[PDB]
Design an enzyme around this catalytic site. Structure first.
Site, PDB file in Angstrom:
ATOM      1  N   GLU A 131     -17.794  19.925  -5.433  1.00 46.83           N
ATOM      2  CA  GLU A 131     -16.514  19.838  -3.990  1.00 46.83           C
ATOM      3  C   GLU A 131     -17.638  19.545  -2.505  1.00 46.83           C
ATOM      4  O   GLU A 131     -17.031  18.266  -2.322  1.00 46.83           O
ATOM      5  CB  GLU A 131     -15.968  21.399  -3.678  1.00 46.83           C
ATOM      6  CG  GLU A 131     -15.237  21.502  -4.533  1.00 46.83           C
ATOM      7  CD  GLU A 131     -14.512  20.793  -4.916  1.00 46.83           C
ATOM      8  OE1 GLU A 131     -14.035  19.849  -4.613  1.00 46.83           O
ATOM      9  OE2 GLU A 131     -13.580  21.172  -5.879  1.00 46.83           O
ATOM     10  N   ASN A 168      -7.013  12.957   1.476  1.00 42.32           N
ATOM     11  CA  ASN A 168      -6.183  13.284  -0.174  1.00 42.32           C
ATOM     12  C   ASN A 168      -5.208  12.269  -0.238  1.00 42.32           C
ATOM     13  O   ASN A 168      -4.789  11.822   0.670  1.00 42.32           O
ATOM     14  CB  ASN A 168      -5.287  14.307  -0.766  1.00 42.32           C
ATOM     15  CG  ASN A 168      -6.629  15.382  -0.931  1.00 42.32           C
ATOM     16  OD1 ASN A 168      -6.534  16.501  -0.535  1.00 42.32           O
ATOM     17  ND2 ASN A 168      -7.825  15.197  -1.547  1.00 42.32           N
ATOM     18  N   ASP A 180      -1.840  12.158  -0.254  1.00 37.47           N
ATOM     19  CA  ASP A 180      -0.385  12.984   0.124  1.00 37.47           C
ATOM     20  C   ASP A 180      -0.901  12.425   1.144  1.00 37.47           C
ATOM     21  O   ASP A 180      -0.189  13.173   1.711  1.00 37.47           O
ATOM     22  CB  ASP A 180      -0.349  14.515  -0.595  1.00 37.47           C
ATOM     23  CG  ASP A 180      -1.060  15.408  -0.637  1.00 37.47           C
ATOM     24  OD1 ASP A 180      -2.233  14.836   0.114  1.00 37.47           O
ATOM     25  OD2 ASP A 180      -0.941  16.045  -0.760  1.00 37.47           O
ATOM     26  N   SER A 194      -2.833  14.794   2.991  1.00 38.57           N
ATOM     27  CA  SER A 194      -3.831  16.377   3.283  1.00 38.57           C
ATOM     28  C   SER A 194      -4.598  15.810   3.410  1.00 38.57           C
ATOM     29  O   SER A 194      -5.188  14.422   3.147  1.00 38.57           O
ATOM     30  CB  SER A 194      -3.682  17.126   2.248  1.00 38.57           C
ATOM     31  OG  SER A 194      -4.339  17.194   1.161  1.00 38.57           O
ATOM     32  N   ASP A 219      -9.122  17.783   2.519  1.00 40.48           N
ATOM     33  CA  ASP A 219     -10.436  18.646   1.876  1.00 40.48           C
ATOM     34  C   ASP A 219     -11.240  19.007   3.318  1.00 40.48           C
ATOM     35  O   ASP A 219     -12.198  18.386   3.438  1.00 40.48           O
ATOM     36  CB  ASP A 219     -10.576  18.284   0.803  1.00 40.48           C
ATOM     37  CG  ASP A 219      -9.225  18.417  -0.400  1.00 40.48           C
ATOM     38  OD1 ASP A 219      -8.484  19.018   0.022  1.00 40.48           O
ATOM     39  OD2 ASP A 219      -9.771  17.840  -1.319  1.00 40.48           O
ATOM     40  N   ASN A 273      -8.139  22.779   0.918  1.00 37.89           N
ATOM     41  CA  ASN A 273      -6.790  21.798   1.500  1.00 37.89           C
ATOM     42  C   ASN A 273      -5.557  22.387   2.587  1.00 37.89           C
ATOM     43  O   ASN A 273      -5.244  23.531   2.539  1.00 37.89           O
ATOM     44  CB  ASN A 273      -6.185  21.337   0.135  1.00 37.89           C
ATOM     45  CG  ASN A 273      -4.891  19.811   0.332  1.00 37.89           C
ATOM     46  OD1 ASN A 273      -4.187  20.378   0.762  1.00 37.89           O
ATOM     47  ND2 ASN A 273      -5.926  19.662  -0.004  1.00 37.89           N
TER      48      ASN A 273
END
Ligand SMILES: Cn1c(=O)c2[nH]cnc2n(C)c1=O
EC number: 3.2.1.17
Length: 129
Positions: free
Chosen positions: A35, A46, A48, A50, A52, A59
């Site tokens: 990650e 991301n 969309d 959002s 992380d 998220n």
């Protein structure tokens, strides 16, 4: 902060992640490796909108507030910035909520795709824990 492999294992154990929800420490270290590459300051936007955040790439659509993810929730009751600290307490506490949400560690797609089923114990091999 960029943790070493065994250094992060020890910090995760210190915060009660080892065998949390049945997931051995190697699973958590493996997830953090893919990650964030063990970097607490890792962020990734991301598709969309959002974002992380942190060692476990938590998220903003569900788990933390960053003020810029429309319609999102803040289920860990933290600013997403708290997930970037050198102290991993906020990330661990929030990850405990995530892994308890129903799908276990499958919530981390990189864990499912790169750690699940593999020899995750290798990630803590040699560590004084
Ligand atoms: C619908 N939904 C989700 O899809 C989800 N994903 C992660 N937490 C979630 N919560 C709390 C939720 O309500």
């Amino acid at each position: 902060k960029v943790f070493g492999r065994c250094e992060l294992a020890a910090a995760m154990k210190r915060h009660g992640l080892d065998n949390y929800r049945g997931y051995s420490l190697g699973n958590w270290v493996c997830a953090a490796k893919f990650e964030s590459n063990f970097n607490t300051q890792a962020t990734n936007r991301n598709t969309d909108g959002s974002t992380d955040y942190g060692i476990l790439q938590i998220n903003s659509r569900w788990w933390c507030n960053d003020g810029r993810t429309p319609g999102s929730r803040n289920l860990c009751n933290i600013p997403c910035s708290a997930l970037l600290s050198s102290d991993i307490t906020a990330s661990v506490n929030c990850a405990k909520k995530i892994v308890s949400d129903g799908n276990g560690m499958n919530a981390w797609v990189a864990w499912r795709n790169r750690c699940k089923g593999t020899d995750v114990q290798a990630w803590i091999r040699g560590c004084r824990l």
